[PDB]
Structure formats: C-alpha cells, structure tokens
C-alpha cells in the first residue's frame, strides 16, 4: 500500500500507492516484475520531493468545489522538475 | 486536515492527518511501514520534542499552513535529517559579472 | 575594477565620504587624489546594486548639512556682540563650501 | 433640428 | 547649425546596433542608462528586440524607476501592446506568480515586492490596463493580509484605494462596493489601534463609483466626506484626484458655483506640478470639460477635450482606452456643439475611433463600450436625418437603433432598471423613435425616461427638463397634441432658466417649439409674446459668448490649496 | 591649459583644458579643491575608468570641439562595438 | 588641421597642427608641456626616423588619415646618458 520511491542519491520518498498512481510511469513501474522500491537513478532527490508534494496535491484537490491554489514550482527547480514531469508522465 | 512529511534520516511520510488528531495516532502511521515500536520512535519538529498529549493543532501544524503543495515538516528519531540535494544555482542575470 | 554597477556597503563609503564632505564644506584641505577619488564613491552609490543608494545618500547628506549649520548656529549665537564678524567668517566658508560640495554631488 | 442636444 | 551628438547619444546608438551580442550585459547597466538603451530600441522601431525584455518583470522593474522619463515609457509601453505581444498581461501574471511564492518569507522581501507591485500596478492602472492592474493589486493585497500588525494594515488600505480605482476604469462597479467595505475593515482595524489613516483618496474613488452608478445623492455625500480629510501633507496626485471627482459629483448635482472653484483649482494644481503634458493633467481636463458641457459653456468645451485628447494621443500611443475615452467625450462634445449646424464628420470620426479602440481591447459586453457606442448612434441618427437619400436615411437610422439597444442592455444589466444612465438611453431611444416615425413607440420611451429620472433625481432637475424637451418636441411637431405639449415646454422653460437664465442656448429648441405650439391652436398674440423672448435669447447669448478660453481662465496661481477646500466645505 | 587625465592603470591622457571642460564631471572634478595645481597642469585620477576607453573619451573631446556648430556635415564618431558598452557607462559618468 | 596623438610610455598627449606645419614646432608644443628641450625629444613616428626639420605633409600622414575621429599615434623618446632611448609605447588595455 506504500511505494518505496528512492532517488538518485539513495533518498526514499515513500507515499500512499493511490497517490503514486497519478503518474502513468510509476503505475507502469509497479506493474510487471516487482508495491516495492523502483530505480530512479536519473531523477535527483530535490526535484522528486516536489513530485511527491504534487502527488498529494493532485489527489486531494480532484473535483474541488473551491478554486485550487497554484502549485508552487520554484524558479531554480522549474527546469529540472519539468523533465521529471515528462519522464514520470505525471 | 493537515498534511505533513516525517523525516528521521531520509524516510519521508507523506500522510495526511486531521488537525484535531493527536501525535499518538500519527505515531501508529509511521510504524505501518517502518515496522518499528512506537515507544522508541520520537519526533522533533525544529529540534523540539512533541508531547503525545497535545493534538496536531497545538503544535503549530495549522491546516491553513499545512497545504498539500507545501506541507509542514516534522522530525523523527529512534537528529540526522540530511538535506535532499542542492538545486543548480541559477544566475541572477541582473548581477554584475 | 570597472565603473559598472556593483554592490557597495553604504557605511564604509559614507564614512569615507563624510570626512571629505566635512572638510569640503569648512574649506579645509583635501588632496587632489581624494577629491577625484570621492567622485567615484558618489557614482558607486547612485548606481549601487540591488537598490540604488541615491536616496540614502541624499538623506544622510541632508541630515549632515542640517547638523552642520545648526552646529555653526551654536558657534555664532553664543558669540554675542561679534555676530556680524562671526557670521561672515562662517558664511564665506559655507558659501564656497556649498558650491564645492555641489560639484562633488554632481552625479 | 427640434429635439435639442441629445443627452 | 550641425551640432555633433553627445558621446552618450552616440554610445547609445552603438550598443543598440550591437544589441544581440550585448543584450546580456545591458541588463546590468544603471537604470538611467538602461532605459535609454531600451528607448533607443523603440526609436529604431526594433520592438521585437524590446518587448522581449519588457515581458520580463525584473527589467520592467528597473525601467519603472526612471521617473523622469515615464512619459516616454508610456508611449514605449503602448507601442508594445499595439505591436502584438501582451506585455501588460504577461507582466501582471508574471508578478502574481512571483508574488505568490514569497508568501512564506520575512517582512523585508515581502515589502520589496509590494513596492514593485505599487509601481507596476501603478503603471498599468495609469496606462489604462485596469483588467491587468487589478491582478497585480489583488496579489499585493494578499501579501498585506498575511501579516496582521499595524505596519501592513496601512498598505492593505493602500491597495484597496487603488483596487477601488482599477475597478472603476474597468467598470466592475459591483466589486467596487465590496472592495470599499473590505477597505473599511482594514481601516477600522488600523484606526482603532492608535494610528489614524488619511481617508481622503479612498472616499474620492467612491465619489466616482457612486457617480458612475448615478447615485448622485450618495455621490455628493461622499464628495463632502472626501474633502473633509484633505490635508496639506497629502500628495498632489491624491489631492488633484479628489478634486476632479468632487467636481464631477457637484456638476451633476446641478450646483455650478461650487463646482467651478473645485475643478479650476484642480486644473491649476495639475498644471504647475504635472505640467501641460502629463496624463494626469489631461485627466483633469477631461473632468474639467464635463463641467463646461453641463453649464452650457459648450463653445470652449470642445477646445478642452481636444487639448485633453491631444495630450493622451502623444503619451498613450494609438490604441489605448484612455485615448478612446477622450475620443468618446470629444465626439459627444462635438456632437452637442455642432448639433445646430448639422455637420458631423469630425464628430463621427472621433466616435468611430472610440469604438475601433475599445472593441479591440475590451470584451463585447463591457459597460464602457456601451457609453462610447451611444455617441456614434446619436451622431448617426442626425446624419440619417440631414442626408437627403431615403435609402441612406432608413439604413443609417436602423444602425443607430441597434447601437442604443446594445448600449441599453449593457447599462441595464449592471445599473439596473432604475438609474439615470438606463433612463438616459430611454430618452436617446425615445428621440430615435421620433426620427424613425414611430411616434407611438416614442411616447412610451420618454414617459419611462422621465418617470425614472423624476423618481430618482427629483421633480425639478436639469436632466429631467432636457428629457421633457425631447417629449415636448414629440407632442408638438409630429403628434399634434398641443395641449399636452403646452405644459411640457413650460416645464422645461422654468428649469432651463432656473440654473442658466434666459440666455441658456438650449432654450432655442424650447422657445421656437412654443412658437410652433401656438401656430396651430390660434392665440397669435402669444406668438409675438414668445417672439421677442427669442430675440431676447439671441441678445442674451451672443453678448456673453465673447469670453476668453478656459485654458487661460485658470491663469497662473488663481487661488491656493486648503482654501478652496475650506470655501467649499462651509457652503 | 593642459589637463592630465589619468586612467585606472596609470595611463596619462594630457589634453587641452578647453577640450576637457565639455565633460560635466571633469568640469566638476577640476572645480573646487581640485585647483591645487601641479604647475599649470591639473591631473585627474580616474579610479574606475580604464585606459582603452579613456582614449576614446579624449578622442571624443577633440571631436566635439572641432566640429562644434560646424557648417559641414559631421562624420560619425568611430566607436568599436566591442567597447560600445564600457564607453556608454563612461559617457554619463563623465557627462560628456 | 591634422590631429595627432603624441604618446610615449604612459603619456598620450593630444594636440593638433596644420597639414603643412613643420615637425619642429610640434616638438615645441611638447617642449612647453614636459619642459624638455626640443632637441632632447625624438619623434619616433611609426618606428621610422623623423628629422628635426621636414613637414607634416610629407611626414607620412595627411589630415584625412589622421582625422580627430581616430588620430594617428606618434611616438616620442628622450636622450639619457648621452644616447637616445628607443620608443617604449604599449597598448592601452585589454577590453573585455
């Protein structure tokens, strides 16, 4: 029910499985051989933390009645996070 | 509702909790995956231990400052919370060079 | 070192300029090297990064001059029966000490 | 012209 | 004489010619130099090389600190907006995104960005981009709400006085009241805690919001309250802002003795400080011409909108709402001035221009687009009468029918059924139905027009009388109900001379109508009884016609500040 | 009569006083306690202005005076695009 | 009127002279600046010998090729220890 989300620098970011199913790549990583750890040797930890912060942001705010606040993506992290968003297909 | 991450050394617990909940039930959430006894585990926000008697709202973890996009942080110990990484320092452009 | 904008601490420049501006107003002796040096310090404050310290420079000078004339005012009011000699002695120093300081603050 | 200036 | 160019103006033209290589290093230059490089790019017409830098907020923060050359920035900014690139909406969004990120910071960084917002939002609001300035202020407002001490409460009321100003140029009145109510929440909190805030600029905006919604009874109440808080320590920009709005509420109050001293002091106060080229000076002239048009001083009202337009046509580029607003009022003033002559070709060009601009920059359902749409329709119906081609007469008069109804709907949607502006369209549509030979339909429009104005304004008012004369001409010239028209002409006669005397130039259509009134019901003795009064009107109008232009009427230093306020307050 | 402008690196640029008084800063630099002249040649020690641009300023000084209110069309000042920036920063500092 | 850039070591004197003016009086202008005798100074114009007489017309440059927009350099050197030293002019600076 928890997914071991390690980073390039050996940093784990475990989160609920239903939250980690927002990204289509992680859903594909869970499928096949191997709710366990998945190799993330390319994506670094400082940008994967923001992905995990987005995961709880996406699921909680689905069909929200109120206006959803902007997800903060810092300027120093924006370019690296964008490739992570495409690679994860989040 | 209060969203938090729990960091002992590098494990991170992105699990929500009610603003009126106490620390005791959140400690049971940590042992769900870390499979460690809850009495040994102790938490340290801003290097300060949190009492199990007080609820989440009494520790400053207000739901208005615990948004899912930027959840508040809290430590954990059985502190050695290492930083994730250093993002590449982008130039300020307008600085002289 | 180029004359492009750069970050500069106001206190070090203002203290290095307060001694020159104190001697310029009172028609004291400031060497040619320092007076031409003090023009760059005026420039480096009006184009300082990130905030142009042109308002702080003009406020501190305004406070400094307001300090100076009321200092001269205390040295004249006490000297009764010779105010006219003391005023003009302190006026020709300040009348030339304003146009000279006007040139220093030209930027 | 009979209705004066239009308002 | 062939004077050589300064080394500055030569090095400027040498770094602009090498801009591609030196674009990185130009952004590090001082503010005075950096703006002169960018203005040279506009002079060379290389707007693409320029709008690529103004879209960044940090560069537009540096070129906004050049207060001496702000009049060149407005023309350089407006050129970008007409060029294509939405440099106003990009800056406003890029500020809101950057402002939303420093919410979790100290009071030093937050105050740095709030001051950027007050000069950026103070520039977009100045250039006319009210829909894009509000997004800047709404981000500046939510920075002041995070900290709830006495220091930041004075900025939240500083945003709300500006938010109330960008929500009136955008004609979002129904949000304006909620903004004012939110301001008082941040005013009572600050005022109670041992720090009284100057409630003078803020009440001046309500003098224009409630003026806009035709709440002239409520406008004058806040007109007095605004000027009671005028203090010599206030900025001249704030002080001249209260005076012009106070004049507009006093003129529509139909009291003109107190109105002239407020706006003639405003024009003088906006000419000695801002000068004859700053947009604020032309803004005061636009409200000054409002005073001239309602006091029947129509002869020099055109010359004061043309001055107001020519200032805005030089500072605010081609397609700007402020230019369009001047085009609207100049078209209306030229309409009123040349109504008797019947030649509307300069007036039509101005009215068409004010629509070619507003439709480009505003949505199709904007209130300010409606008021600028009625002026063309008024001009079209007069051309549809003066022209002798029956095919042109019918089609152009039908085009003016779609414009009033479109204009009426936008006013009726926001101002409600019971307002002067809604009734003003009823009277204009009533006059149009008279020209459309729909005399049965023209009856019920004027009746609804007068009944709404009489209920709101009162039994005796200048606007009511001018509407009655529209109905009086209907009952007299083409409906032959002389008994009904007899009381209507007399009703406007008393009100017309009540605030203007017998020399009111609008009485020409009132006295002459009385002559035709008595021509078809006998009683030819009274025909000569009104015939000499028409000559009396001729004598009492041309003799007072010879007067100096209003531009030099204010002259130099006519009165003093904190004296016109006291003179007006006691009366 | 002659004014000895000194660059950052020590390069002297001795030029006539009349030519070097078209510069607002140099006019202000000589005016005041800058008149304590060595002989009749006042020196100016520019701490920030480098030598490679100070020649172009001086070469502008003779360019301004000679072509002042001239009858003929004035040739454009030859400014290298590689130094068009360091000269631009030194064209408002010197007010020339 | 030809504009020149008489320079040695660090000094970069800026003067002017007529097209047909003599080279000797050009040394006289420099004579009244650094108080050196006219025969003491030697004009090593473009690393070639220049006699104390001659004239600027046949010196090697005209007014058009040494315009005030970009005047042409002229070397200079003095005689020390009963022998004339070679020119030692160096480039101004390296512009970044």
mmCIF file of N, CA and C in Angstrom, chain E residues 226-293:
data_model
loop_
_atom_site.group_PDB
_atom_site.id
_atom_site.type_symbol
_atom_site.label_atom_id
_atom_site.label_comp_id
_atom_site.label_asym_id
_atom_site.label_seq_id
_atom_site.Cartn_x
_atom_site.Cartn_y
_atom_site.Cartn_z
ATOM 1 N N UNK E 226 -14.947 63.208 1.387
ATOM 2 C CA UNK E 226 -13.607 63.114 0.824
ATOM 3 C C UNK E 226 -12.799 64.369 1.113
ATOM 4 N N UNK E 227 -13.389 65.542 0.889
ATOM 5 C CA UNK E 227 -12.662 66.794 1.038
ATOM 6 C C UNK E 227 -12.486 67.214 2.490
ATOM 7 N N UNK E 228 -13.271 66.657 3.412
ATOM 8 C CA UNK E 228 -13.053 66.922 4.828
ATOM 9 C C UNK E 228 -11.743 66.330 5.325
ATOM 10 N N UNK E 229 -11.200 65.339 4.620
ATOM 11 C CA UNK E 229 -9.955 64.696 5.004
ATOM 12 C C UNK E 229 -8.772 65.155 4.164
ATOM 13 N N UNK E 230 -8.938 66.215 3.373
ATOM 14 C CA UNK E 230 -7.820 66.752 2.609
ATOM 15 C C UNK E 230 -6.871 67.481 3.549
ATOM 16 N N UNK E 231 -5.597 67.107 3.496
ATOM 17 C CA UNK E 231 -4.561 67.675 4.341
ATOM 18 C C UNK E 231 -3.395 68.084 3.454
ATOM 19 N N UNK E 232 -2.708 69.162 3.843
ATOM 20 C CA UNK E 232 -1.588 69.661 3.053
ATOM 21 C C UNK E 232 -0.462 68.643 2.925
ATOM 22 N N UNK E 233 -0.370 67.685 3.846
ATOM 23 C CA UNK E 233 0.639 66.650 3.742
ATOM 24 C C UNK E 233 0.350 65.575 2.718
ATOM 25 N N UNK E 234 -0.842 65.586 2.130
ATOM 26 C CA UNK E 234 -1.193 64.602 1.121
ATOM 27 C C UNK E 234 -0.416 64.855 -0.169
ATOM 28 N N UNK E 235 -0.152 63.807 -0.950
ATOM 29 C CA UNK E 235 0.481 64.011 -2.256
ATOM 30 C C UNK E 235 -0.431 64.794 -3.183
ATOM 31 N N UNK E 236 0.189 65.548 -4.092
ATOM 32 C CA UNK E 236 -0.576 66.365 -5.029
ATOM 33 C C UNK E 236 -1.399 65.477 -5.950
ATOM 34 N N UNK E 237 -0.860 64.310 -6.307
ATOM 35 C CA UNK E 237 -1.596 63.359 -7.134
ATOM 36 C C UNK E 237 -2.887 62.918 -6.456
ATOM 37 N N UNK E 238 -2.829 62.645 -5.153
ATOM 38 C CA UNK E 238 -4.036 62.305 -4.407
ATOM 39 C C UNK E 238 -4.976 63.499 -4.330
ATOM 40 N N UNK E 239 -4.433 64.685 -4.050
ATOM 41 C CA UNK E 239 -5.268 65.866 -3.850
ATOM 42 C C UNK E 239 -5.992 66.235 -5.139
ATOM 43 N N UNK E 240 -5.277 66.236 -6.266
ATOM 44 C CA UNK E 240 -5.930 66.553 -7.532
ATOM 45 C C UNK E 240 -6.916 65.455 -7.910
ATOM 46 N N UNK E 241 -6.689 64.228 -7.435
ATOM 47 C CA UNK E 241 -7.613 63.137 -7.724
ATOM 48 C C UNK E 241 -8.950 63.344 -7.024
ATOM 49 N N UNK E 242 -8.925 63.824 -5.779
ATOM 50 C CA UNK E 242 -10.165 64.060 -5.048
ATOM 51 C C UNK E 242 -10.925 65.236 -5.646
ATOM 52 N N UNK E 243 -10.205 66.282 -6.058
ATOM 53 C CA UNK E 243 -10.857 67.486 -6.565
ATOM 54 C C UNK E 243 -11.628 67.214 -7.852
ATOM 55 N N UNK E 244 -11.027 66.475 -8.789
ATOM 56 C CA UNK E 244 -11.694 66.235 -10.066
ATOM 57 C C UNK E 244 -12.942 65.379 -9.891
ATOM 58 N N UNK E 245 -12.878 64.361 -9.030
ATOM 59 C CA UNK E 245 -14.061 63.549 -8.761
ATOM 60 C C UNK E 245 -15.101 64.327 -7.971
ATOM 61 N N UNK E 246 -14.659 65.199 -7.061
ATOM 62 C CA UNK E 246 -15.594 66.045 -6.326
ATOM 63 C C UNK E 246 -16.315 67.003 -7.261
ATOM 64 N N UNK E 247 -15.604 67.531 -8.257
ATOM 65 C CA UNK E 247 -16.236 68.408 -9.237
ATOM 66 C C UNK E 247 -17.299 67.671 -10.037
ATOM 67 N N UNK E 248 -17.014 66.431 -10.442
ATOM 68 C CA UNK E 248 -17.963 65.683 -11.258
ATOM 69 C C UNK E 248 -19.248 65.388 -10.498
ATOM 70 N N UNK E 249 -19.155 65.150 -9.189
ATOM 71 C CA UNK E 249 -20.361 64.965 -8.394
ATOM 72 C C UNK E 249 -21.091 66.279 -8.152
ATOM 73 N N UNK E 250 -20.362 67.391 -8.058
ATOM 74 C CA UNK E 250 -21.014 68.677 -7.847
ATOM 75 C C UNK E 250 -21.680 69.185 -9.118
ATOM 76 N N UNK E 251 -21.056 68.961 -10.275
ATOM 77 C CA UNK E 251 -21.656 69.394 -11.534
ATOM 78 C C UNK E 251 -22.956 68.646 -11.788
ATOM 79 N N UNK E 252 -22.953 67.330 -11.569
ATOM 80 C CA UNK E 252 -24.168 66.549 -11.757
ATOM 81 C C UNK E 252 -25.190 66.851 -10.668
ATOM 82 N N UNK E 253 -24.750 67.407 -9.537
ATOM 83 C CA UNK E 253 -25.668 67.934 -8.536
ATOM 84 C C UNK E 253 -26.348 69.214 -9.007
ATOM 85 N N UNK E 254 -25.968 69.721 -10.182
ATOM 86 C CA UNK E 254 -26.550 70.896 -10.823
ATOM 87 C C UNK E 254 -26.310 72.176 -10.036
ATOM 88 N N UNK E 255 -25.331 72.174 -9.138
ATOM 89 C CA UNK E 255 -24.845 73.387 -8.498
ATOM 90 C C UNK E 255 -23.483 73.720 -9.090
ATOM 91 N N UNK E 256 -23.385 74.885 -9.724
ATOM 92 C CA UNK E 256 -22.234 75.211 -10.547
ATOM 93 C C UNK E 256 -21.311 76.247 -9.928
ATOM 94 N N UNK E 257 -21.791 77.020 -8.952
ATOM 95 C CA UNK E 257 -20.929 77.994 -8.291
ATOM 96 C C UNK E 257 -19.834 77.304 -7.487
ATOM 97 N N UNK E 258 -20.182 76.241 -6.759
ATOM 98 C CA UNK E 258 -19.180 75.481 -6.023
ATOM 99 C C UNK E 258 -18.397 74.531 -6.915
ATOM 100 N N UNK E 259 -18.920 74.209 -8.098
ATOM 101 C CA UNK E 259 -18.255 73.252 -8.974
ATOM 102 C C UNK E 259 -17.039 73.856 -9.663
ATOM 103 N N UNK E 260 -17.143 75.110 -10.111
ATOM 104 C CA UNK E 260 -16.059 75.715 -10.879
ATOM 105 C C UNK E 260 -14.800 75.878 -10.041
ATOM 106 N N UNK E 261 -14.946 76.280 -8.778
ATOM 107 C CA UNK E 261 -13.764 76.516 -7.956
ATOM 108 C C UNK E 261 -13.036 75.219 -7.629
ATOM 109 N N UNK E 262 -13.745 74.087 -7.610
ATOM 110 C CA UNK E 262 -13.082 72.817 -7.333
ATOM 111 C C UNK E 262 -12.259 72.345 -8.523
ATOM 112 N N UNK E 263 -12.798 72.466 -9.732
ATOM 113 C CA UNK E 263 -12.103 71.925 -10.892
ATOM 114 C C UNK E 263 -11.101 72.917 -11.482
ATOM 115 N N UNK E 264 -11.370 74.222 -11.395
ATOM 116 C CA UNK E 264 -10.382 75.191 -11.853
ATOM 117 C C UNK E 264 -9.165 75.208 -10.942
ATOM 118 N N UNK E 265 -9.359 74.953 -9.647
ATOM 119 C CA UNK E 265 -8.220 74.721 -8.770
ATOM 120 C C UNK E 265 -7.523 73.411 -9.106
ATOM 121 N N UNK E 266 -8.283 72.397 -9.524
ATOM 122 C CA UNK E 266 -7.679 71.122 -9.892
ATOM 123 C C UNK E 266 -6.829 71.249 -11.149
ATOM 124 N N UNK E 267 -7.319 71.979 -12.154
ATOM 125 C CA UNK E 267 -6.553 72.154 -13.386
ATOM 126 C C UNK E 267 -5.267 72.919 -13.107
ATOM 127 N N UNK E 268 -5.350 73.974 -12.293
ATOM 128 C CA UNK E 268 -4.148 74.704 -11.905
ATOM 129 C C UNK E 268 -3.197 73.821 -11.109
ATOM 130 N N UNK E 269 -3.728 73.040 -10.166
ATOM 131 C CA UNK E 269 -2.869 72.194 -9.349
ATOM 132 C C UNK E 269 -2.280 71.039 -10.148
ATOM 133 N N UNK E 270 -2.926 70.646 -11.241
ATOM 134 C CA UNK E 270 -2.396 69.618 -12.124
ATOM 135 C C UNK E 270 -1.583 70.188 -13.274
ATOM 136 N N UNK E 271 -1.408 71.506 -13.338
ATOM 137 C CA UNK E 271 -0.576 72.120 -14.363
ATOM 138 C C UNK E 271 0.731 72.680 -13.833
ATOM 139 N N UNK E 272 0.756 73.174 -12.597
ATOM 140 C CA UNK E 272 2.006 73.673 -12.039
ATOM 141 C C UNK E 272 2.938 72.540 -11.637
ATOM 142 N N UNK E 273 2.386 71.409 -11.202
ATOM 143 C CA UNK E 273 3.197 70.277 -10.772
ATOM 144 C C UNK E 273 3.432 69.292 -11.914
ATOM 145 N N UNK E 274 2.352 68.755 -12.479
ATOM 146 C CA UNK E 274 2.480 67.727 -13.503
ATOM 147 C C UNK E 274 2.882 68.297 -14.855
ATOM 148 N N UNK E 275 2.503 69.533 -15.147
ATOM 149 C CA UNK E 275 2.818 70.144 -16.418
ATOM 150 C C UNK E 275 1.764 69.864 -17.469
ATOM 151 N N UNK E 276 1.907 70.546 -18.601
ATOM 152 C CA UNK E 276 0.921 70.501 -19.674
ATOM 153 C C UNK E 276 1.045 69.266 -20.554
ATOM 154 N N UNK E 277 1.798 68.256 -20.127
ATOM 155 C CA UNK E 277 1.984 67.044 -20.911
ATOM 156 C C UNK E 277 1.726 65.764 -20.134
ATOM 157 N N UNK E 278 1.741 65.803 -18.807
ATOM 158 C CA UNK E 278 1.495 64.611 -18.014
ATOM 159 C C UNK E 278 0.055 64.146 -18.206
ATOM 160 N N UNK E 279 -0.187 62.833 -18.262
ATOM 161 C CA UNK E 279 -1.561 62.349 -18.462
ATOM 162 C C UNK E 279 -2.524 62.773 -17.373
ATOM 163 N N UNK E 280 -2.042 62.970 -16.144
ATOM 164 C CA UNK E 280 -2.923 63.407 -15.068
ATOM 165 C C UNK E 280 -3.488 64.791 -15.353
ATOM 166 N N UNK E 281 -2.688 65.661 -15.966
ATOM 167 C CA UNK E 281 -3.196 66.966 -16.367
ATOM 168 C C UNK E 281 -4.311 66.831 -17.394
ATOM 169 N N UNK E 282 -4.137 65.941 -18.373
ATOM 170 C CA UNK E 282 -5.199 65.700 -19.342
ATOM 171 C C UNK E 282 -6.388 65.003 -18.703
ATOM 172 N N UNK E 283 -6.144 64.189 -17.677
ATOM 173 C CA UNK E 283 -7.242 63.585 -16.935
ATOM 174 C C UNK E 283 -8.096 64.649 -16.263
ATOM 175 N N UNK E 284 -7.456 65.673 -15.696
ATOM 176 C CA UNK E 284 -8.200 66.762 -15.074
ATOM 177 C C UNK E 284 -8.968 67.568 -16.114
ATOM 178 N N UNK E 285 -8.382 67.759 -17.299
ATOM 179 C CA UNK E 285 -9.084 68.463 -18.369
ATOM 180 C C UNK E 285 -10.325 67.705 -18.813
ATOM 181 N N UNK E 286 -10.255 66.374 -18.825
ATOM 182 C CA UNK E 286 -11.416 65.579 -19.209
ATOM 183 C C UNK E 286 -12.571 65.795 -18.244
ATOM 184 N N UNK E 287 -12.281 65.846 -16.944
ATOM 185 C CA UNK E 287 -13.314 66.168 -15.970
ATOM 186 C C UNK E 287 -13.651 67.650 -15.971
ATOM 187 N N UNK E 288 -12.694 68.502 -16.345
ATOM 188 C CA UNK E 288 -12.991 69.922 -16.492
ATOM 189 C C UNK E 288 -13.975 70.163 -17.626
ATOM 190 N N UNK E 289 -13.824 69.436 -18.732
ATOM 191 C CA UNK E 289 -14.777 69.552 -19.818
ATOM 192 C C UNK E 289 -16.141 68.993 -19.495
ATOM 193 N N UNK E 290 -16.225 68.087 -18.520
ATOM 194 C CA UNK E 290 -17.528 67.666 -18.023
ATOM 195 C C UNK E 290 -18.259 68.833 -17.378
ATOM 196 N N UNK E 291 -17.532 69.665 -16.629
ATOM 197 C CA UNK E 291 -18.134 70.855 -16.040
ATOM 198 C C UNK E 291 -18.610 71.826 -17.112
ATOM 199 N N UNK E 292 -17.805 72.029 -18.156
ATOM 200 C CA UNK E 292 -18.159 73.005 -19.182
ATOM 201 C C UNK E 292 -19.383 72.581 -19.980
ATOM 202 N N UNK E 293 -19.543 71.283 -20.239
ATOM 203 C CA UNK E 293 -20.642 70.843 -21.090
ATOM 204 C C UNK E 293 -21.981 70.920 -20.367
#
